[PDB]
Amino acid sequence: NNNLAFGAGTDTKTSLQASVSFADLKIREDYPASLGKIRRIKQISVTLPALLGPYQDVQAILSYGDKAGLANGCEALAVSHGMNDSGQFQLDFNDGKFLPFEGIAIDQGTLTLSFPNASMPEKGKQATMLKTLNDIILHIRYTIK
Amino acid sequence: RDKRALEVERTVSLAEVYAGLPKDNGPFSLAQEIDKLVSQGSGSAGSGNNNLAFGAGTDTKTSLQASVSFADLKIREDYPASLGKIRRIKQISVTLP
Amino acid sequence: AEQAYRWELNDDSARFIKPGAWQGTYAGLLAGETLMLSLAQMEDAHLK
Structure with a gap:
């Protein structure tokens, strides 16, 4: 899951997809487990330290794999x-x-x-x-309860 | 049916779409042509909806109208169609350097 | 409101709404008073 490749499906062949696995980040090791075993993401922001054009914008889609219990959109x-x-x-x-x-x-x-x-x-x-x-910077905000 | 949308801001430069017109549709430069339209009495520029002209109706003859077509901006090509087929404008702001 | 309860407190097994508030024999005359108790049991369990 820590790969850098293109889109495998239709009409996304020209899309550069940079994926990362949550289990390889080891965010749970940053605090002791006695604080709380329920740790869930609150909000994720993206910082892209890249040289831009004069009047230009970045197109990028930050998505997730599992649509099981999460809301619409x-x-x-x-x-x-x-x-x-x-x-x-x-x-x-x-x-x-x-x-x-x-x-x-x-x-x-x-x-x-x-x-x-x-x-x-x-x-x-x-x-x-x-x-x-x-670089691609992810500001992950999460709660410990 | 209500969902949270992928809401996107796109910056449009009208000098870069008037110079990026096709060959027989008469492309032009925005900065030179406003100097031409203001200085003389009447005039025109471009073709179709991507034009630069004056008001055709009453009491707007002295109004310099810079129009642009949405279909020639090709904003839909900036994202794949698998994300969603319903794309609608939320808000438009104007910057005049 | 139950699915919003399950998503904030990580308890998918939690169940407060039960299929008995409508009684077709008595035309369901206490359907609103039964669901209002189940919403009050849901929030009192949320505050704790």
Whole structure:
């Protein structure tokens, strides 16, 4: 699950997908288990320290594998500017609705990030931006209870 | 039926879409042409909905109208169609440098 | 409201709404008073 490849399904062949496994991050080891055994994600933001164009935007989709107990549309996230970027227009913690990735367990899952129109031999518009991409930063906010 | 949508902000430069017009549709530069439209009495630029002209109706003859077509922006090509087929505008802001 | 209860407290096995509030024999006259008790049992278990 810690791979870097393209989309296997239809009409996503030119999408650069950077996936990561939650179990290989070992976030549970950062605190003792006597604090609490229930640790679940609250909110995930994306920072992309990349050189951008003059008036340009990043297209990126941060999605999740398992749609089992999660709400409708809370499995994905759209990155637009990539500087402490969440999918929301206004990140409001009191709107009454569940955030994207809220309630996902710390240990299990697979977190992927697709970059549409990425391949240069098909002349994608994001082929030039990804050459200057240094790192992908995930601000994972989680609760311990 | 209510879901949380992938809500996306896209920045559009009208100088880069008027210069990026096809060959026989008469592309132009935005900064040079406004200097041409303002200085003289009447004029026009471009073809179709991606034009630069004046108001055709009453009491708007002195109004410089810069129009653009949504279908020529090709915003739908920025994401795969497997994400969703319903894509609708939420809010539009204007920056004038 | 039960599925929002199960998602905030990590208890999928939790069950407060039970299929007996509608009695077709008596036209279900206490259907609202039975579900109002089950919503009160759900929130009192949520506050604790």
